[PDB]
Design an enzyme around this catalytic site. Structure first.
Site, mmCIF file in Angstrom:
data_model
loop_
_atom_site.group_PDB
_atom_site.id
_atom_site.type_symbol
_atom_site.label_atom_id
_atom_site.label_comp_id
_atom_site.label_asym_id
_atom_site.label_seq_id
_atom_site.Cartn_x
_atom_site.Cartn_y
_atom_site.Cartn_z
ATOM 1 N N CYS B 30 0.812 -1.210 0.000
ATOM 2 C CA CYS B 30 0.000 0.000 0.000
ATOM 3 C C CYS B 30 0.849 1.265 0.000
ATOM 4 C CB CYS B 30 -0.926 0.012 1.212
ATOM 5 S SG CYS B 30 -1.929 1.500 1.351
ATOM 6 N N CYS B 33 -0.215 3.735 3.170
ATOM 7 C CA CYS B 33 0.285 3.146 4.414
ATOM 8 C C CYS B 33 1.713 3.608 4.660
ATOM 9 C CB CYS B 33 0.259 1.610 4.352
ATOM 10 S SG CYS B 33 -1.342 0.819 4.669
#
Ligand SMILES: [Mg+2]
Lengths: 673, 105
Positions: B30, B33
């Site tokens: 991600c 993230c």
DNA sequence: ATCACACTACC
DNA sequence: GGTAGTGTGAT
């Protein structure tokens, strides 16, 4: 000769209303139309052409129009009507023989789009008529503010239907003539639109007669159907579905679920340079939100990006998931697909080795799962599933294209009854047993019918013997029916275990590869070429044969086809598979003229073809037939007759290798193996 | 000073703990993230007295996230006595978190 | 080799 | 509700 075509309210199976028909008579050059109330006259017109020893042309008439007219005549006019086989010509049967290197939509059953290669124009037009007609209909109703329903275009006669009907004879007549202009099948000396039926079969290539007799008999077979034990398969489905669930449970435990990006619209760009990062999963930037003064219960904060994800649960059917979990266990893919992706077929799964024992053990569960699903798919859940195909009469009427293959082999579909799992594979007994004459109770005595399965013996080798007889004087042929050809080939090639040679030969005939060839003895994959050299070295006739075939085709081609046993042209895709095309085509035409001659001989013996008779053809799978018989005695006769006919076929084509058959009597396809 | 979680230590580290605990469900692949990650180190250090920050990598710990309907990452879950007090998805900013925290703590 | 058809993943 | 890719089922 006359070209004709009709419009009715449904498919053969359930048709009950004759909407209209059209006839073009060559002797008068005119088109006569017959509306609903002219049905009796339409029928009189066809019998008239029969009384004068004429010919009637239909497009796909062998499978639809002729059987349809019989049925509709009995239902609407309480009249018996039976066009004789010898008086009918089918332009669909003709195109499949002449343009054998092409496919077709099986009169609209298959989507043109999905079909490869070009399509004969007239034939495409004829097969798309039901679809076009439905389009004009549906388009015209909507202009009248009415809802369109399923297939209401065929419920009542109308003039748009009559126009399409005339159109068909127009195109059919054009297609017919296009086909008659091929001098290879029809001599230029003769005008085939001006000869009696007996001359038409007589003066044209033998293949025309064979294909028409083959289409006619096979049309009958589809009507007979193959008695099917529905209850049996449902009970098997419950079993299979159970084993599938349990295999999913054990597997969905050993391999946990994970998360995957999904639903991302915007591109992820480095927060510092802006450098787009396509390698990174797509994200999504909420346009609203904020931390808030009442707190904002919502979970998004404008400008704050996130990668939307989904929760994927291990699905043993997905080779991708399987490839994902096994590499994650230490599996290093060796062979990838010719398009970026690891190979995950039963063969490689078989060779995968991982540290974790539970994983190594799950691999077998995965293989079992794939097989189970294969069976469920074919018997109950798939589109062409058996359970979805059985009819009210308790039989599966599988479709057969008498000449759907280049070599002259038939193709079977809806559902392909030529691909039922064999008795040797997992659950093959039960599958195979569900197809049998025993599942048909006599219409009079209520007693189960008996089955007769006849298999042409080692046809591929005999066809090979025959063709190499020109070079070895029947040496191979003689060895087949007297010595142990398998041993002879075992000595030709080295291969220890004169039984690996049997694996070798049938492989050598059906393509195969150096790897799989050497994979018979051991590893020696491509290194196995050495073995495929010693053989051809110790069997010079096969080499001579190949060389001669080449001289026939290659020179860039001198000719792009091979001449089959009945004279037809047999398109050769690649010079490399020429011997194969020749052999398959021989076996093909031998088995076609064979099942044809068999039924003729049975009929000349007194026996009647039908469930209301003595015997019923249920299926023909290349080198074999399964025939339903009312009694064992009759079953014994069919078997004996299938043997006579095979010899007759061999004699008929001056075959240089004696031909045989073996038959077994029993209640179903399992025992008759 | 961040609690690195596992599926098996979740119930006891988060649900059966005193005080507010902010959990970050994230993944290596991600983008957002990896973005909010540094922010968390600071937050964990600043609120070092009235809050504990815990990370749960959902690829190594595939059993927990599903129980909360995670549908996007990074997902921030604020627990108070074993329940989800507040929840926000997306790579918030050092200050947006401060707001979310101060406002929910 | 010749052919049918199923199940996943993607638009 | 279709297409492409990968596979298995049979002779
Ligand atoms: Mg027609």
């Amino acid at each position: 000769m006359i070209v004709s075509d009709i419009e009715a309210n449904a498919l053969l199976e359930s048709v009950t209303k004759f909407h209209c028909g059209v006839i073009y008579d060559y002797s008068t050059a005119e088109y006569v139309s017959y509306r609903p109330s002219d049905f009796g006259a339409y029928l009189d017109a066809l019998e008239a052409e029969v009384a004068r020893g004429g010919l009637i042309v239909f497009h796909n008439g062998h499978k639809y129009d002729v059987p349809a007219l019989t049925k509709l005549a009995k239902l609407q006019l309480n009249r018996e009507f039976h066009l004789p086989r010898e008086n009918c010509i089918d332009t669909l049967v003709l195109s499949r023989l002449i343009h054998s290197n092409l496919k077709d939509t099986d009169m609209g059953l298959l989507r043109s789009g999905k079909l490869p290669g070009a399509l004969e124009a007239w034939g495409y037009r004829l097969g798309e008529m039901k679809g076009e007609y439905k389009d004009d209909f549906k388009r015209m109703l909507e202009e009248q503010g009415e809802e369109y329903v399923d297939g209401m275009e065929w419920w009542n006669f109308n003039e748009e239907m009559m126009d399409y009907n005339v159109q068909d004879v127009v195109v059919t007549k054009a297609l017919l003539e296009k086909l008659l202009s091929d001098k290879h099948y029809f001599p230029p000396e003769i005008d085939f639109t001006d000869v009696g039926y007996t001359t038409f079969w007589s003066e044209s290539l033998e293949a025309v007669d064979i294909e028409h007799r083959a289409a006619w008999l096979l049309a009958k077979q589809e009507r007979n159907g193959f008695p099917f034990d529905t209850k049996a398969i449902e009970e098997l489905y419950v079993e299979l579905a159970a084993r599938r669930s349990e295999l999913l449970r054990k597997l969905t435990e050993t391999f946990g679920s994970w998360y995957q990006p999904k639903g991302g619209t915007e591109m992820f760009c480095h927060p510092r340079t802006g450098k787009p990062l396509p390698k990174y999963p797509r994200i999504k930037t909420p346009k609203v939100g904020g931390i808030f003064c009442e707190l904002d219960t919502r979970e998004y904060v404008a400008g704050a990006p996130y990668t939307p994800v989904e929760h994927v649960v291990f699905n043993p059917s997905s080779r991708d998931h399987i490839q994902k979990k096994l590499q994650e266990a230490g599996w290093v893919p060796t062979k990838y697909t010719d398009k970026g992706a690891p190979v995950v077929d039963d063969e490689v799964l078989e060779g995968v080795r991982v540290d974790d024992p539970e994983k190594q053990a799950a691999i077998d569960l995965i293989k079992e799962y794939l097989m189970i699903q294969k069976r469920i798919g074919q018997s109950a859940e798939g589109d062409k599933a058996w359970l979805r195909y059985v009819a009210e009469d308790g039989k599966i009427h599988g479709s057969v294209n008498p000449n759907g293959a280049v070599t002259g082999r038939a193709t079977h579909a809806f559902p392909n009854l030529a691909q039922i799992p064999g008795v040797r594979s997992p659950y093959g007994e039960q599958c195979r047993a569900a197809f049998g004459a025993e599942h048909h109770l006599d219409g009079i005595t209520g007693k189960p019918w008996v089955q007769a399965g006849i298999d042409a013996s080692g046809l591929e080798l005999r066809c090979l013997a025959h063709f190499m007889a020109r070079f070895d004087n029947g040496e191979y042929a003689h060895e087949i029916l007297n010595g142990d050809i398998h041993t002879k080939n075992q000595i030709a090639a080295e291969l220890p275990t004169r039984d690996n040679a049997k694996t070798f030969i049938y492989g050598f005939l059906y393509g195969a590869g150096d790897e799989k060839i050497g994979q018979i003895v051991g590893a020696g994959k491509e290194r196995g070429k050495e073995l495929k050299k010693k053989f051809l070295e110790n069997t010079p006739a096969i080499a001579a044969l190949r060389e001669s075939i080449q001289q026939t085709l290659v020179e860039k081609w001198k000719r792009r086809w091979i001449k089959g046993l009945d004279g037809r042209k047999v398109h050769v895709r690649s010079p490399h598979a020429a011997l194969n095309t020749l052999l398959q085509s021989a076996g093909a035409l031998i088995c076609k003229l064979w099942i044809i001659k068999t039924e003729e001989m049975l009929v000349e013996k007194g026996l009647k073809h039908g469930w209301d008779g003595d015997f019923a053809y249920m299926a023909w799978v290349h080198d074999e037939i399964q025939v339903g018989c009312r009694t064992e005695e009759i079953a014994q006769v069919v078997i004996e007759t299938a043997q006579e006919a095979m010899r007759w076929v061999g004699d008929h084509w001056n075959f240089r290798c004696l031909l045989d058959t073996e038959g077994k009597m029993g209640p179903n396809w399992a025992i008759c193996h | 000073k961040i609690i690195h979680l596992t599926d098996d230590s979740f119930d006891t580290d988060v649900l059966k703990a005193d005080g507010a605990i902010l959990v970050d469900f994230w993944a290596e692949w991600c983008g957002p993230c990896k973005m909010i990650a540094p922010i968390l180190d600071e937050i964990a250090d600043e609120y070092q007295g009235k809050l504990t920050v815990a990370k749960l990598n959902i690829d190594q710990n595939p059993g927990t996230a599903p129980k909360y309907g995670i549908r996007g990452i990074p997902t921030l879950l604020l627990f108070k006595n074993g329940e989800v007090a507040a929840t926000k998805v997306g790579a918030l900013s050092k200050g947006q978190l401060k707001e979310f925290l101060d406002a929910n703590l």
